Write a protein that binds this ligand. Structure first.
Ligand SMILES: [Mg+2]
Ligand SMILES: [Mg+2]
Ligand SMILES: [Mg+2]
Ligand SMILES: [Mg+2]
Length: 176
């Protein structure tokens, strides 16, 4: 309750979103662009929190880009978490500056040893931020605790191994 989350660079995300966001995935792992960063308010300055992200299927389809349009061409193929390095930390710490997840990497390697987030190319995905609160003793592990989940629709994207839409390729270059 009363915890709020604000997406950093929301305008840039929207630029990509309007066109149809694509994120490159590679065997070794590739960072997202834009970077996913958030501002958080309403945390108890004293209580400890764990922040983490996951990236879940946005739907159960597989896609193809053709004639300047994304289309569903079939069912999604048969199907990890990123814990923020600072976790756990006081609400005061989390609120002091932006919470950046820019180190998060995407891979297409189903046998990835690095613990990167594994995605399937030509599938649509939705990043989610989770905030997990410590227990009554301000510790973790001894009880299942309360947590909240924040979903920014404008951060959804299709995973690709190379850019499909020319507008995306142009946006990536102009901004990164
Ligand atoms: Mg799309
Ligand atoms: Mg590769
Ligand atoms: Mg990279
Ligand atoms: Mg289908």
């Amino acid at each position: 309750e009363g915890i709020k989350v604000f997406l950093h660079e929301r305008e840039l995300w929207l630029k990509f979103h309007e066109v149809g966001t694509e994120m490159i995935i590679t065997k070794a792992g590739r960072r997202m662009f834009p970077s996913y960063k958030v501002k958080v308010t309403g945390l108890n300055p004293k209580t400890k929190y764990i922040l983490l992200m996951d990236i879940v299927p946005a739907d159960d389809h597989r896609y193809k880009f053709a004639d300047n349009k994304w289309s569903v061409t079939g069912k999604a193929e048969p199907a990890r978490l990123y814990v923020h390095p600072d976790s756990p930390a006081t609400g005061a710490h989390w609120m002091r500056q932006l919470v950046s997840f820019q180190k998060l990497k995407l891979t297409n390697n189903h046998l990835d040893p690095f613990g990167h987030i594994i995605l399937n190319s030509m599938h649509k995905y939705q990043p989610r931020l989770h905030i997990v609160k410590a227990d009554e003793n301000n510790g973790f592990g001894s009880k299942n605790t309360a947590f909240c989940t924040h979903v920014f629709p404008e951060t959804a994207f299709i995973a690709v191994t190379s850019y499909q839409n020319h507008k995306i390729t142009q946006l990536k270059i102009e901004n990164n």
